[PDB]
Amino acid sequence: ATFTIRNNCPYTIWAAAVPGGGRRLNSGQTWTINVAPGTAGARIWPRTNCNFDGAGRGRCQTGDCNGVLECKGYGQPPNTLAEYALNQFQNLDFFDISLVDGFNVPMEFSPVSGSGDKCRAIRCTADINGQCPNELRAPGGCNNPCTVFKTDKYCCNSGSCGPTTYSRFFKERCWDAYSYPKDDPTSTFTCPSGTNYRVIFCPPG
């Protein structure tokens, strides 16, 4: 499956993908990756304000993946996440935007020419950074209350949680994204396997 990753932000984004690695994307640049069928536990996310050396080692302000350019694992919150698993049950792809690990940059995650009623574009473009509750603010973004407060109410460790005032901050601004760990019904999208995708940072309206 092809994922076309485009930076439409006026600032530089260091794209990250597991699988895929990572690439510096100046404003307007694209990174195209191809991923094997059956790829699961996958994400794509933006990183802001990275400083890497010639060996590709350093630090990003948001979404840092163990101090390297080409990610071999997940990143540090706050980071807006495109999550997916391909060719799963009934050969369906399942994909979502998640804010459970916070928000750093606005995003569209969409199938190319999508087939099926739930095979459609997902967008989170509200000014979440600007509107972020002060208690949720972090360098470069807005953390989910689970990251900040670390209690069962927000983190759902026991499996018995629900929407909160803080999760609703996210959900009311980006209704199609996961806002807390058990936000499953109104947030998982599906396409037939074989579908290709785009991820756009700072998408136009």
GROMACS .gro file of C-alpha atoms in nm:
model
  205
    1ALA     CA    1   0.000   0.000   0.000
    2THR     CA    2   0.127   0.349  -0.087
    3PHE     CA    3   0.121   0.633   0.167
    4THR     CA    4   0.181   0.978   0.022
    5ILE     CA    5   0.299   1.206   0.306
    6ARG     CA    6   0.291   1.577   0.227
    7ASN     CA    7   0.393   1.876   0.434
    8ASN     CA    8   0.156   2.166   0.357
    9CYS     CA    9   0.271   2.358   0.667
   10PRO     CA   10   0.469   2.682   0.622
   11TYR     CA   11   0.725   2.538   0.868
   12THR     CA   12   0.950   2.232   0.836
   13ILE     CA   13   0.815   1.901   0.956
   14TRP     CA   14   1.028   1.594   1.018
   15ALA     CA   15   0.792   1.319   0.909
   16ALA     CA   16   0.802   0.990   1.098
   17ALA     CA   17   0.665   0.651   1.007
   18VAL     CA   18   0.666   0.308   1.165
   19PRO     CA   19   0.734   0.127   0.938
   20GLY     CA   20   0.917   0.370   0.709
   21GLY     CA   21   1.169   0.561   0.918
   22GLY     CA   22   1.172   0.938   0.879
   23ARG     CA   23   1.250   1.233   0.654
   24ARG     CA   24   1.289   1.610   0.680
   25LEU     CA   25   1.009   1.774   0.483
   26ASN     CA   26   1.052   2.143   0.406
   27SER     CA   27   0.732   2.335   0.335
   28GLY     CA   28   0.556   2.177   0.037
   29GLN     CA   29   0.770   1.862   0.021
   30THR     CA   30   0.640   1.505  -0.013
   31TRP     CA   31   0.765   1.168   0.112
   32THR     CA   32   0.619   0.858  -0.051
   33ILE     CA   33   0.640   0.522   0.125
   34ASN     CA   34   0.523   0.176   0.029
   35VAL     CA   35   0.423  -0.064   0.299
   36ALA     CA   36   0.371  -0.445   0.282
   37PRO     CA   37   0.018  -0.589   0.295
   38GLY     CA   38  -0.069  -0.700   0.648
   39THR     CA   39   0.139  -0.426   0.809
   40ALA     CA   40  -0.008  -0.364   1.153
   41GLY     CA   41   0.059  -0.153   1.462
   42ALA     CA   42   0.163   0.119   1.222
   43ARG     CA   43   0.169   0.496   1.254
   44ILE     CA   44   0.267   0.810   1.070
   45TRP     CA   45   0.316   1.135   1.261
   46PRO     CA   46   0.474   1.482   1.236
   47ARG     CA   47   0.770   1.597   1.447
   48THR     CA   48   0.851   1.964   1.508
   49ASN     CA   49   1.181   2.142   1.579
   50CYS     CA   50   1.429   1.857   1.539
   51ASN     CA   51   1.802   1.899   1.562
   52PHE     CA   52   1.997   1.604   1.425
   53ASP     CA   53   2.367   1.558   1.353
   54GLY     CA   54   2.529   1.398   1.049
   55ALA     CA   55   2.470   1.054   1.200
   56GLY     CA   56   2.100   1.137   1.221
   57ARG     CA   57   2.108   1.159   1.600
   58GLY     CA   58   1.952   1.437   1.807
   59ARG     CA   59   1.620   1.554   1.953
   60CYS     CA   60   1.280   1.678   1.835
   61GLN     CA   61   1.060   1.909   2.044
   62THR     CA   62   0.754   1.693   1.973
   63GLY     CA   63   0.711   1.332   1.864
   64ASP     CA   64   1.075   1.239   1.926
   65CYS     CA   65   1.152   0.873   1.852
   66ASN     CA   66   1.444   0.775   2.079
   67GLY     CA   67   1.667   1.054   1.947
   68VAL     CA   68   1.699   0.951   1.580
   69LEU     CA   69   1.587   1.079   1.240
   70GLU     CA   70   1.477   0.744   1.094
   71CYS     CA   71   1.234   0.614   1.355
   72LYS     CA   72   1.253   0.252   1.468
   73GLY     CA   73   0.977   0.297   1.725
   74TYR     CA   74   0.700   0.533   1.840
   75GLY     CA   75   0.739   0.899   1.936
   76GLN     CA   76   0.697   1.118   2.245
   77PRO     CA   77   0.369   1.305   2.310
   78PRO     CA   78   0.233   1.549   2.215
   79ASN     CA   79   0.201   1.413   1.862
   80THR     CA   80  -0.096   1.398   1.625
   81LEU     CA   81  -0.121   1.035   1.507
   82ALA     CA   82  -0.231   0.862   1.188
   83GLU     CA   83  -0.270   0.498   1.291
   84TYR     CA   84  -0.339   0.200   1.066
   85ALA     CA   85  -0.345  -0.176   1.016
   86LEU     CA   86  -0.377  -0.329   0.668
   87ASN     CA   87  -0.543  -0.647   0.541
   88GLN     CA   88  -0.697  -0.739   0.875
   89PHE     CA   89  -1.027  -0.919   0.934
   90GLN     CA   90  -1.214  -0.976   0.606
   91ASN     CA   91  -0.916  -0.812   0.435
   92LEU     CA   92  -1.018  -0.472   0.568
   93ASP     CA   93  -0.781  -0.185   0.645
   94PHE     CA   94  -0.858  -0.010   0.976
   95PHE     CA   95  -0.733   0.343   1.023
   96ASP     CA   96  -0.784   0.649   1.245
   97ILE     CA   97  -0.652   0.979   1.367
   98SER     CA   98  -0.573   0.966   1.739
   99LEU     CA   99  -0.527   1.246   1.991
  100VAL     CA  100  -0.481   1.004   2.281
  101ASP     CA  101  -0.111   1.092   2.272
  102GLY     CA  102  -0.191   1.459   2.215
  103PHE     CA  103  -0.185   1.710   1.930
  104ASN     CA  104   0.108   1.895   1.772
  105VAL     CA  105   0.023   1.965   1.407
  106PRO     CA  106  -0.312   1.955   1.218
  107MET     CA  107  -0.362   1.660   0.983
  108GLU     CA  108  -0.572   1.500   0.713
  109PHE     CA  109  -0.553   1.120   0.679
  110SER     CA  110  -0.751   0.995   0.380
  111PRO     CA  111  -0.782   0.712   0.133
  112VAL     CA  112  -0.714   0.784  -0.233
  113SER     CA  113  -1.044   0.737  -0.418
  114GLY     CA  114  -1.203   0.561  -0.119
  115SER     CA  115  -1.457   0.278  -0.157
  116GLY     CA  116  -1.723   0.206   0.108
  117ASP     CA  117  -1.920   0.433   0.342
  118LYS     CA  118  -1.650   0.441   0.613
  119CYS     CA  119  -1.368   0.471   0.360
  120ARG     CA  120  -1.340   0.849   0.376
  121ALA     CA  121  -1.115   1.136   0.476
  122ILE     CA  122  -1.041   1.200   0.843
  123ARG     CA  123  -0.946   1.558   0.939
  124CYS     CA  124  -0.826   1.734   1.251
  125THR     CA  125  -0.769   2.099   1.165
  126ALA     CA  126  -0.905   2.295   1.461
  127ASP     CA  127  -0.655   2.528   1.632
  128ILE     CA  128  -0.595   2.282   1.916
  129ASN     CA  129  -0.255   2.436   2.002
  130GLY     CA  130  -0.401   2.784   2.036
  131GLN     CA  131  -0.708   2.674   2.228
  132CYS     CA  132  -0.533   2.421   2.455
  133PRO     CA  133  -0.626   2.436   2.824
  134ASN     CA  134  -0.325   2.577   3.011
  135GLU     CA  135  -0.294   2.264   3.223
  136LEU     CA  136  -0.258   2.055   2.906
  137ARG     CA  137   0.004   2.271   2.732
  138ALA     CA  138   0.343   2.114   2.663
  139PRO     CA  139   0.641   2.230   2.456
  140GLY     CA  140   0.523   2.232   2.095
  141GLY     CA  141   0.169   2.107   2.153
  142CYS     CA  142  -0.129   2.002   2.361
  143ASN     CA  143  -0.115   1.682   2.568
  144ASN     CA  144  -0.406   1.447   2.631
  145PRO     CA  145  -0.512   1.447   2.999
  146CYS     CA  146  -0.393   1.085   3.023
  147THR     CA  147  -0.034   1.200   2.966
  148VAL     CA  148  -0.066   1.494   3.207
  149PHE     CA  149  -0.268   1.350   3.495
  150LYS     CA  150  -0.191   0.977   3.465
  151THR     CA  151  -0.506   0.854   3.643
  152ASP     CA  152  -0.751   0.578   3.553
  153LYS     CA  153  -1.020   0.837   3.480
  154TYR     CA  154  -0.819   0.953   3.178
  155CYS     CA  155  -0.599   0.652   3.096
  156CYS     CA  156  -0.861   0.375   3.121
  157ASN     CA  157  -0.618   0.121   3.269
  158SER     CA  158  -0.910  -0.062   3.431
  159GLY     CA  159  -1.128  -0.058   3.119
  160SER     CA  160  -1.393   0.150   3.296
  161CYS     CA  161  -1.365   0.506   3.168
  162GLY     CA  162  -1.574   0.752   2.970
  163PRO     CA  163  -1.557   1.102   2.820
  164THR     CA  164  -1.418   1.375   3.045
  165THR     CA  165  -1.416   1.753   3.034
  166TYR     CA  166  -1.060   1.736   2.900
  167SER     CA  167  -1.129   1.463   2.643
  168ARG     CA  168  -1.429   1.663   2.522
  169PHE     CA  169  -1.198   1.957   2.453
  170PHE     CA  170  -1.042   1.747   2.179
  171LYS     CA  171  -1.360   1.566   2.067
  172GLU     CA  172  -1.563   1.883   2.019
  173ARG     CA  173  -1.292   2.029   1.795
  174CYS     CA  174  -1.208   1.712   1.597
  175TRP     CA  175  -1.513   1.486   1.614
  176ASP     CA  176  -1.368   1.207   1.400
  177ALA     CA  177  -1.048   1.154   1.604
  178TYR     CA  178  -0.995   0.937   1.915
  179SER     CA  179  -1.005   1.172   2.215
  180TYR     CA  180  -0.960   0.914   2.492
  181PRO     CA  181  -0.869   0.543   2.501
  182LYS     CA  182  -1.226   0.403   2.468
  183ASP     CA  183  -1.347   0.641   2.194
  184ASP     CA  184  -1.381   0.345   1.954
  185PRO     CA  185  -1.730   0.376   1.791
  186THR     CA  186  -1.704   0.725   1.641
  187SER     CA  187  -1.338   0.704   1.540
  188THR     CA  188  -1.243   0.389   1.346
  189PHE     CA  189  -1.258   0.408   0.968
  190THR     CA  190  -1.230   0.119   0.723
  191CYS     CA  191  -1.132   0.059   0.359
  192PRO     CA  192  -1.092  -0.255   0.150
  193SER     CA  193  -0.738  -0.384   0.155
  194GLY     CA  194  -0.548  -0.269  -0.150
  195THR     CA  195  -0.645   0.091  -0.081
  196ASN     CA  196  -0.379   0.364  -0.093
  197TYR     CA  197  -0.362   0.666   0.139
  198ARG     CA  198  -0.243   1.020   0.191
  199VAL     CA  199  -0.134   1.199   0.506
  200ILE     CA  200  -0.123   1.579   0.476
  201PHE     CA  201   0.019   1.808   0.748
  202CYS     CA  202  -0.160   2.144   0.769
  203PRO     CA  203  -0.411   2.049   0.498
  204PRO     CA  204  -0.595   2.328   0.317
  205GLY     CA  205  -0.966   2.382   0.386
   0.00000   0.00000   0.00000
